[PDB]
Design a protein around this ligand. Sequence first.
Ligand code: GSH
Ligand code: GSH
Ligand code: CL
Lengths: 210, 215
Amino acid sequence: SMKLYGLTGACSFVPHVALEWVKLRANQDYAFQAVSREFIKSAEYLALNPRGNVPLLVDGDLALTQNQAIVHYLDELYPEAKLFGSKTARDKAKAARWLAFFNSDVHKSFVPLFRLPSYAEGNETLTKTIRQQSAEQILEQLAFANAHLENHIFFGEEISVADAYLYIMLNWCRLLGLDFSHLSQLSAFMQRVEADQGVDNVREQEGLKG
Amino acid sequence: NLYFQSMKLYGLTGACSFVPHVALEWVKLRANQDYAFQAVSREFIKSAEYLALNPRGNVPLLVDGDLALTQNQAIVHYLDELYPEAKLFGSKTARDKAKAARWLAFFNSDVHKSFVPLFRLPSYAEGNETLTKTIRQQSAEQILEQLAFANAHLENHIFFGEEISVADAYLYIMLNWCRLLGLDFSHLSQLSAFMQRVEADQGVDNVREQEGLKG
Ligand SMILES: N[C@@H](CCC(=O)N[C@@H](CS)C(=O)NCC(=O)O)C(=O)O
Ligand SMILES: N[C@@H](CCC(=O)N[C@@H](CS)C(=O)NCC(=O)O)C(=O)O
Ligand SMILES: [Cl-]
């Protein structure tokens, strides 16, 4: 049985949702191990993942990192679970495109809001500037996602791992006090994602409600 | 013939779009499917005509009929689904493919961004000589720490797939960026040998020719 190491509420939410969909749709249970930021820098965890971060999926002798690799792997093993919102190559790729945008381009913009560059620490003006630029970048990227939702209810034909990724980044925005109320589709999107049983179960497990 | 055109890749020569270019060349060589390559300028990708195809104004972009597909990882996973026989991830087996996909993701999502400040200095450092030097040094250090991790893998593996893969193509082009930037990685001893192995691949060789990367 596979095991996922994750930080609750972090990007590892997405493979956690994927695993729960596999559970609900393909009848395969899995283990979730919530980790602390202290544990992931521990000698024990570093021996499994020298990069000292999450997600990490363990499936027997396979220790697999990277959000996109994990979910593409699960999709290959369990095509019937429709992790990318469809079974057809074209539609899966379109959802994979959104996942990749979120994971490679958007998540990136958040990094300075979670961990300030070393050169900025103690510099009030530079710190403010870096945080401002991150906020502006995020809002510009969210506007692009929001525009898509003007004509589509999800980032797949049905709900997909891309939707889970945007959802969690919007939860980060709420926690950081980065408002997105001007992007008119995002609130309803969050409600639709929250209505999915797999998402609901994971939000419960990771302590994300309320 | 008149109803189905080859796939078309828009790319910047020598940039990250090299990777799906190599993927398409491998599909050509191994699955006998030709494709079109359109080299673009940095000016053309900010043009009105191009923004109509790709509002994000960057590359790669793969057009296959009515599908306009962006993102390196999405493009290569798509081609792998259509042409599994091409072994774009260095294997046909799900676990071996996933391990290669993990390296591709590391390169595309984690390492590539470390280069960003070296290609385009953050605006707030413009005109600030000391901050500019600190940013560039720190970015160079970050890249080398990430490359050291790739180097370690190569201590007991010939490639990042079981056979050569899109992950190898991604590291390769980043090491080409390092050379072009003057970022010395020669203390990581597996990397030069790795570049030679990658360059020996027929598909890589073909794409390097097409993109003008030989010297
Ligand atoms: N490209 C990686 C990025 C993973 C990543 O950024 N992980 C972060 C957030 S989930 C993390 O573990 N941060 C804690 C730390 O690095 O100490 C992936 O997609 O898996
Ligand atoms: N996450 C995107 C990143 C695309 C990207 O970084 N593209 C660069 C090339 S390395 C680009 O288009 N740069 C535009 C320019 O240099 O003007 C992907 O994987 O496709
Ligand atoms: Cl994109």
